[PDB]
Design a binder for this molecule. Sequence first.
Ligand code: COA
Ligand code: COA
Ligand code: COA
Lengths: 151, 151, 153, 152, 153, 152
Amino acid sequence: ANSERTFIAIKPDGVQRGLVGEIIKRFEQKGFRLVGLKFLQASEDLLKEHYTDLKDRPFFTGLVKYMHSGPVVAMVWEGLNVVKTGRVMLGETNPADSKPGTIRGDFCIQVGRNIIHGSDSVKSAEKEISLWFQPEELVEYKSCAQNWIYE
Amino acid sequence: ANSERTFIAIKPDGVQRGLVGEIIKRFEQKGFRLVGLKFLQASEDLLKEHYTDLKDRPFFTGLVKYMHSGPVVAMVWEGLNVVKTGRVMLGETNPADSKPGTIRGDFCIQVGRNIIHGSDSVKSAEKEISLWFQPEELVEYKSCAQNWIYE
Amino acid sequence: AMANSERTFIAIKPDGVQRGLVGEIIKRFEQKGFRLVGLKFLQASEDLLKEHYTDLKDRPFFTGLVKYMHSGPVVAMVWEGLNVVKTGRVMLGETNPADSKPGTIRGDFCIQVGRNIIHGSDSVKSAEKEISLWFQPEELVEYKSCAQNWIYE
Amino acid sequence: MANSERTFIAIKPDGVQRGLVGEIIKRFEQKGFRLVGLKFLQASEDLLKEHYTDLKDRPFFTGLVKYMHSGPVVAMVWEGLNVVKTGRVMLGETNPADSKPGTIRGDFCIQVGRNIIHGSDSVKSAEKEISLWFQPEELVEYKSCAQNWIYE
Amino acid sequence: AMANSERTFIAIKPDGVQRGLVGEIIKRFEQKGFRLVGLKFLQASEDLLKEHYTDLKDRPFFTGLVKYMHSGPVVAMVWEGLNVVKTGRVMLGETNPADSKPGTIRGDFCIQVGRNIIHGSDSVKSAEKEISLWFQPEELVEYKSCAQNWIYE
Amino acid sequence: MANSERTFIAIKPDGVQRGLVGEIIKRFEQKGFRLVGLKFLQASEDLLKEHYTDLKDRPFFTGLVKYMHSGPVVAMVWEGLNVVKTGRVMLGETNPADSKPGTIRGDFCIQVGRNIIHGSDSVKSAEKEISLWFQPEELVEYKSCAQNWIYE
Ligand SMILES: CC(C)(COP(=O)(O)OP(=O)(O)OC[C@H]1O[C@@H](n2cnc3c(N)ncnc32)[C@H](O)[C@@H]1OP(=O)(O)O)[C@@H](O)C(=O)NCCC(=O)NCCS
Ligand SMILES: CC(C)(COP(=O)(O)OP(=O)(O)OC[C@H]1O[C@@H](n2cnc3c(N)ncnc32)[C@H](O)[C@@H]1OP(=O)(O)O)[C@@H](O)C(=O)NCCC(=O)NCCS
Ligand SMILES: CC(C)(COP(=O)(O)OP(=O)(O)OC[C@H]1O[C@@H](n2cnc3c(N)ncnc32)[C@H](O)[C@@H]1OP(=O)(O)O)[C@@H](O)C(=O)NCCC(=O)NCCS
């Protein structure tokens, strides 16, 4: 319950525009803990399975080639309702709909360059975590401030 | 008209997690003027009178003992709608409903660990102010910017 | 593309300069993805403010608004980007800071309606009128931003 | 006994009026030191004169007392290893024109007569100043959750 | 007085503008306690820069410096206060960003010397030469900060 | 060339538990350096030994390996002109008491036994450690879009 995990990935425009540290900071100060972290240049084959739900969409080719044109920061975060609250912290998928104070609302403009991706559901979280991370690369530890975050 | 006061308290999980300065900062940059500030470990008796409207709730015992298990920072802020807008700045009482940009929305997760308390009304404010503070501990002064914060 | 070149006029009111919010104000517009086209430091005359606020000359606060806008220096800015008029309003917040949400410029830094530190063009033609009013075409600097291909698709 | 040394930190009236209170506490909190005492107060010229008793012969003594009395102060007591020494380093030089960027004074003030913050110059100056503004009641003892990550 | 009003000329270079460091630089001078007197956004010409760097015409990097300062728009600013020429130079950092200390402007956002984001008047005399060069007397705004009596005794 | 030099920067277990990861990365990003390698790992007691092989004859070597092993670390590789030397300056002195405000250790830690972050002391140390924590596959080469504004 207090160990739910979600997949968060900083897109190539986030790395290029230098927003990797700020994004990691909003999740740290919130109270979530990092379980996995890697710096990687994804293959278009990997992205196709990650975006297999959108293969019918007209933007699919441009989305896969944009996600491949640069490195990404693949993370795994853990905490009570990390999937949902993470989506709230991220904002709406279109930055034009995001409210200020959200990651997209403070840092990006266009839908095709929305700097960050969050797992839309627990089922989408477990599918994406097992896709980008192996079980070895996920680190298990207890934050020194757990008893001050949860009861 | 601009002299209304509210009671703001940083809960024991807000002191332990190093969130005291940032919390005071949001009320300083907002345009509010600090009137009372103290550092205190509230006795269970001082808390039960503060939470007397919640004595019939099942969590009342765990709420008092958690608020007593650590020191709190008790503050009094004055300004136009410092009670109401203070509730807005704090956000919703359960952090899972709070919006990003609010204090709880940026820094905490669970309801029982929401780092901060605010007065819910002008009637709650007066009672809470007169309960934790004596009339002398309250400092009355004029901010050098009040002609730029108010007209 | 030609839509990504949309422009808006953002002014930092005298209370925003006095309370030292100019750099933080420009920071939210820089970190968002928008580009600086014009920037000047000015003391607007009452005559200049009246034409800028001509659609409020019937309101009772008009005289108090113009003199307060003239009682100090302002920071006139022009910004460009996709929906810079509409999203700038969002980042600014609601005109009354008691309505603004935390995270907005007005929600985070100001209290009273008469001292809401910042102005934003409400529409594209209000932006078109306000940019041509405070800026001459010479004062506007068009440059390609080094991260443009990472802001846009 | 060194992971318990306390120092007295005071935010001057100009530090409050300009709204640097949370910013000052933030640097002490993130540094690793623990907040032991806190109070908001408009100092009387009596306690000021005992606080600055070492400067009674200096020409600025009168203007310093009435300035520190012209507004409210935030009186703080911080605990940690060498909090008296590294507290002075964090503060910067007493003349803000001598403070280095990154310090509280080097970042936030200009003139020496308005240097927003005061630091205890020594452990003996601290315990005198601690006993001056703070009674042993108003000092809170507790263990921070990250102490074992701050100390060995 | 006169000392409580000395002016310097701090310029944000094109790499500071391109990398989104305009708001951060203004915020540091604001929170220091200095008074914004003038501010302009400008693509300065090769000729304006030659006179600005006239004491460096006999240096091999002089031609690549003027073309880099012309390759983008700059933020020209004027700040007023006590010892703001000197203190501003300490805030900027050392001109070689590898010598600038952390906490300075160049120590925090700069690596190479040919890309040192910002310039500061080295002396009061260089200030009054540079200020009169980039700005006209009209564009300089004199006003009284609301916190002056808490910055100066 | 010298715009491509790399260094090895690790965030110790106390830097992670006290939530400093995003801040440490942000200071390197805003400086202008490029992120080359990034991983999150619980280093084994065999890995930090060869990392701290020069300190095996120091009395603290035992408590340092097991402290480095007591939590997860964030191993990083950064590339830029003089990133090894300028990395050390940004970190500050190894003894946080000697670190200057504005550095990572002058802002965020107190004790030598808990200085949150590590930096490569030299180019040859950097290349020895980069090949110790990272394999050539995990290092991502990409041209930062603002390169022509960071370097001339
Ligand atoms: C919406 C509702 C259903 C739930 O919201 P709620 O969190 O329980 O109610 P509140 O937000 O007003 O709680 C206020 C305080 O109680 C605490 N609290 C509330 N629920 C808590 C819980 N489940 N566990 C621990 N603390 C809780 C909160 O920490 C909060 O702290 P605060 O001083 O900072 O404000 C609420 O309206 C409700 O409970 N109504 C019925 C209350 C009632 O009938 N009381 C009579 C006796 S049962
Ligand atoms: C919202 C509206 C309907 C009137 O509501 P309102 O309470 O006046 O709030 P507004 O949105 O008009 O605020 C406009 C400005 O008037 C000023 N203002 C508003 N209320 C004020 C008050 N009580 N005292 C002083 N100034 C006030 C503010 O400065 C405000 O923000 P700005 O300076 O950044 O522009 C207004 O949009 C309106 O009058 N529309 C009709 C004509 C028009 O303005 N059209 C817009 C162009 S399409
Ligand atoms: C390491 C050495 C330089 C002296 O150490 P120093 O003066 O304290 O400063 P340094 O930064 O250079 O190295 C100190 C290391 O020892 C650790 N250390 C020192 N004292 C410690 C203590 N009491 N407890 C825990 N760790 C300690 C430090 O944590 C640091 O490791 P870190 O980077 O993770 O923080 C010395 O032992 C030496 O000569 N080493 C040779 C290795 C080298 O640098 N070769 C370069 C060839 S070009």
